Ligand binder design. Structure first.
Ligand code: CDL
Ligand code: CDL
Ligand code: PLX
Ligand code: PLX
Ligand code: PEE
Ligand code: HEM
Ligand code: HEM
Lengths: 51, 378, 49, 106, 62
């Protein structure tokens, strides 16, 4: 726990953050698409299968 | 130091799937085995959603299915995927057994026997499940099949009534069949685990029949996508059977209510049992027809004993190959005869086809195998 | 020139010439446990990244 | 014990030999034999160069089977070409087993 | 010399697997709707006048 603090751990987390943005976007967009959420989906330019 | 080698669950997955050696030259036929493994899942999952509406009472079993096909949303697709799914299950099953008979895979005798027991399990499962819908053919098939048990010489009728739960087929029999039908497939799964367990300490056979230790290859890179394609073609053929011609593998009359009083004409059991049924039609005696029936499936156990050739696969032994396709044609003959009413032409062809079915693999095959031995000078 | 080198530079260049490539491989025996070329080529890239 | 009819037997054996497909894969006759424990010990006793020739021809067969191809017609094994290398050894092994069994039943 | 469109499609996206999964899901996001209205337009095209949704006009809305 205490050992994980450290400048190289900061450098490493900074190296791996964008990958977390990517997978976070993957899970978020994927979650919305799977459940066909009306509130988030409508905002989109073309996806209007819901009425 | 890969983690697969460390964690025990990842160890077993590393064995059964990701890393176990297989012959490289394995063909499309072996894929059917894995397909069976897939089919069972479907037959569970799909079936699991039919049990949520089905009512196993005799007075309401039919109307509940009407409730599924009509009232329930998307119920009919589940219904037809289930019913056609059993048919695909037995097709892959027959092709699988034919593959095992052709390439000399029966030499793995323990795996062979577990396969036989698992076969009988799947047969009983399909039977009781076909009894569930509670139509005309369902009710009548149950009465006809159950009576065979009555054939046994001393215990007979007490045992038969012990299955019925009464004098005659009725609601308790339907509920019992619903329970056993519910429970059996998972036992089929555990057997399948035994099956693969015995299988993997020797390794999968290859079409040439020669040992493939020189050319073993990891399962993950290749056969996972090969089986992905085979599973995709399987889903293709299944969905084509369900969404275009749901009925043709089935039989009209089941959509009528069961009548204990009235009796349906053609009285034909669903197609995968038909050939066996012909044997019942073939031997005039009751108990003799029953024993011939049990021999029809047990007979597979005797095959390794009857093996005489100093080789596995038929591919290098064309005569035995011709006997093999004679055997397949004969099975088509019985399978067609099971769909027909007794009459002069059929009864004679059925008897000849049955006797030929027994004689070709209890006599001719070993002998022509010996002939193939003498022709090759050893 | 070496002083100019940085960890970001090493990441950019190693990602440029090593990551997701199609390596030449040589093996003088007794090889047999050596992974088939698809396993190696698969081993050239992470899925976590 | 037939004479010219025995030459006829050589003919039908040759035809059946060409009926078997292992010639298409370059295999010697003895490669095709099923490998039970007697054959296993029989292979164990093989001279190294011969054992190597056997293992390689087996790989060539499996590799041809991979791509579903066929060995070129010039390269096919011929009926007179074959050397029945494994027979003496396998006969020694089997005879030893029969000896141990005949001793064992007494 | 000039980069192929497949290459510009590659290095900008495919080299990192997470972006690959992302473009996959977005591609599904469009393909679902496109395949939907397309196949429905086809099935509507085969049997005009048979389907009730266009038969509604003879009796709908008073
Ligand atoms: C019940 C119906 C089930 C049908 C089989 C379903 C799965 C078949 C399979 O194993 O995967 C495809 C599999 C791929 O080839 P493979 O992986 O090398 O299989 C091992 C070969 O059998 C190894 O044997 P082979 O290399 O000597 O080639 C066997 C095959 C040669 O077939 C092939 O080479 C592969 C398929 C190419 C032909 C496709 C034709 C158009 C579709 O020869 C035949 O076609 C059989 C002769 C009688 C049918 C002739 C016309 C059918 C085509 O093709 C076949 O097994 C043959 C399919 C036969 C069609 C049914 C004919 C009716 C009888
Ligand atoms: C959202 C978050 C996603 C990121 C998760 C980060 C977790 C931390 C971590 O250490 O990652 C491990 C591991 C990272 O994979 P990796 O970068 O290839 O490194 C693993 C080692 O190199 C292992 O090296 P290897 O050469 O032994 O690799 C063997 C081969 C494994 O081969 C297979 O995937 C077997 C599949 C076929 C067998 C079935 C046969 C059927 C008959 O490749 C894989 O490891 C793929 C792993 C896929 C599932 C991960 C296992 C957890 C359960 O987790 C992942 O696979 C992340 C990918 C996420 C996929 C998209 C999910 C969207 C939702
Ligand atoms: C509301 C939602 C919030 C969450 C947002 C979405 C989350 C998506 C899923 C997150 C998955 C994380 C992806 C990172 C994968 C990398 C995993 C692993 O490889 O990283 C290791 C370690 O990774 C780091 O520990 C973590 C980096 C990412 C952490 C980002 C978290 C940011 C959260 C901030 C809070 C914001 C939201 C709070 C909501 C409550 C380093 O790898 P390694 O090859 O061994 O290192 C070299 C070898 N060493 C160790 C010997 C040197
Ligand atoms: C009936 C019972 C069986 C079930 C039915 C199964 C039906 C499936 C049959 C169809 C075959 C599918 C196989 C096709 C290949 C799969 C794609 C896979 O190969 O992607 C690989 C890797 O996979 C993806 O990259 C990661 C996932 C991306 C998509 C994720 C979508 C969400 C899935 C999460 C599901 C989790 C299960 C739980 C439900 C939520 C790419 O590897 P590779 O081509 O060699 O190298 C690429 C190099 N890159 C990445 C650097 C570009
Ligand atoms: C019950 C059946 C009811 C089903 C109704 C209709 C079914 C019709 C079945 C007819 C399908 C036969 C077509 C097969 C085509 C074919 O085999 O091509 C020849 C091809 C040539 O093979 P090679 O020797 O490797 O050639 C070497 C070249 N490199 O032969 C084969 O490969 C076939 C071997 C696999 C056997 C699969 C046959 C499927 C049917 C088998 C079932 C019979 C066993 C029944 C036992 C059931 C007991 C519970
Ligand atoms: C190998 C496994 C299985 C096979 C081959 C199989 C096969 C069948 C068959 C042939 C039918 C007759 C349906 C018809 O002809 O209309 C059926 C029905 C049924 N199955 Fe299965 N089955 C299997 C496993 C399961 C499992 C695991 C369940 C779990 C719930 C299940 C639940 C049902 C139910 C409830 C019915 C009757 C409902 C209906 O027909 O509408 N089955 N099955
Ligand atoms: C649901 C039913 C079954 C399942 C899930 C199953 C599962 C499997 C699997 C996964 C394999 C791996 C190799 C391959 O797929 O070709 C296999 C092989 C094998 N199976 Fe089955 N099996 C089933 C039924 C049977 C039956 C009925 C028999 C025999 C009558 C049988 C006999 C064999 C034999 C002998 C092998 C060895 C393959 C080889 O030697 O190359 N199995 N089985």
């Amino acid at each position: 726990v205490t050992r994980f603090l450290g400048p190289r751990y900061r450098e490493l987390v900074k190296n791996w953050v964008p990958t977390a943005y990517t997978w976070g976007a993957v899970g978020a967009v994927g979650l919305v698409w799977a459940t066909d959420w009306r509130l988030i989906l409508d905002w989109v330019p073309y996806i209007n299968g819901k009425f | 130091t890969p983690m697969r080698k460390t964690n025990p669950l990842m160890k077993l997955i590393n064995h059964s799937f990701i890393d176990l050696p297989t012959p490289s030259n394995i063909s499309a036929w072996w894929n059917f085995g894995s397909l069976l493994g897939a089919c069972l899942i479907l037959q569970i999952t799909t079936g699991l959603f039919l049990a949520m509406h089905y009512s196993p009472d005799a007075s309401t079993a039919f109307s509940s299915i009407a409730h599924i096909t009509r009232d329930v949303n998307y119920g009919w697709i589940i219904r037809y995927l289930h019913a056609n799914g059993a048919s695909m299950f037995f097709i892959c099953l027959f092709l699988h057994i034919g593959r095992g008979l052709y390439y000399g895979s029966f030499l793995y005798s323990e795996t062979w026997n577990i396969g036989i027991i698992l076969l009988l399990a799947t047969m009983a499962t399909a039977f009781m499940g076909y009894v569930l819908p509670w139509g005309q053919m369902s009710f009548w098939g149950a009465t006809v099949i159950t009576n065979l048990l009555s054939a046994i010489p001393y215990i007979g009728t007490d045992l038969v009534q012990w299955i019925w739960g009464g004098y005659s087929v009725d609601s308790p029999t339907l509920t019992r069949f619903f329970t056993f039908h519910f429970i059996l497939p998972f036992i089929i799964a555990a057997l399948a685990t035994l099956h693969l367990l015995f299988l993997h300490e020797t390794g999968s056979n290859n079409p040439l029949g020669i040992t493939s230790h020189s050319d073993k290859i990891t399962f993950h890179p290749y056969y996972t996508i090969k089986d992905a394609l085979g599973l995709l073609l399987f889903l293709l053929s299944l969905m084509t059977l369900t969404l275009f011609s749901p009925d043709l593998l089935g039989d009209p009359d089941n959509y009528t209510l069961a009548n204990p009083l009235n009796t349906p004409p053609h009285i034909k059991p669903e197609w995968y049992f038909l050939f066996a049924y012909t044997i019942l039609r073939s031997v005039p005696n009751k108990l003799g027809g029953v024993l011939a029936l049990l021999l029809s499936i047990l007979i597979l156990a005797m095959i390794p004993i009857l093996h005489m050739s100093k080789q596995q696969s038929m591919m290098f032994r064309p005569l035995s190959q011709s006997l093999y396709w004679l055997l397949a044609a004969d099975l088509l003959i019985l399978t067609w005869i099971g769909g027909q009413p007794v009459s002069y032409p059929f009864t004679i062809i059925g008897q000849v086809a049955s006797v030929l079915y027994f004689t070709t693999i209890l006599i001719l095959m070993p002998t022509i195998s010996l002939i193939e031995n003498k022709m090759l000078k050893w | 020139r070496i002083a100019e080198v940085d960890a970001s530079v090493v990441r950019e260049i190693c990602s440029k010439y090593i990551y997701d490539q199609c390596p030449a491989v040589a093996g003088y025996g007794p090889i047999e446990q050596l992974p088939d070329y698809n396993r190696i080529r698969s081993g050239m890239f992470w899925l976590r990244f | 014990a037939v004479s010219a009819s025995g030459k006829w037997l050589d003919g039908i054996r040759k035809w059946y030999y060409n009926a078997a497909g292992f010639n298409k894969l370059g295999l010697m006759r003895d490669d095709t034999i099923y490998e039970d424990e007697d054959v296993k010990e029989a292979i164990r006793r093989l001279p190294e160069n011969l054992y190597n020739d056997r293992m390689f021809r087996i790989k060539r067969a499996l590799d041809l089977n991979l791509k579903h191809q066929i060995l070129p017609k010039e390269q096919w094994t011929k009926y007179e070409e074959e050397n029945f290398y494994l027979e003496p050894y396998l006969k020694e092994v089997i005879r030893e087993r029969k000896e141990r069994e005949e001793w064992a039943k007494k | 010399a000039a980069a192929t469109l497949t290459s510009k499609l590659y290095s900008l996206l495919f080299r990192r697997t997470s972006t690959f999964a992302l473009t996959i899901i977005v591609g599904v996001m469009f393909f679902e709707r496109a395949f939907d209205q397309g196949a429905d337009a086809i099935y509507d095209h085969i049997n005009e006048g048979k389907l009730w949704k266009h038969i509604k006009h003879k009796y709908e809305n008073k």
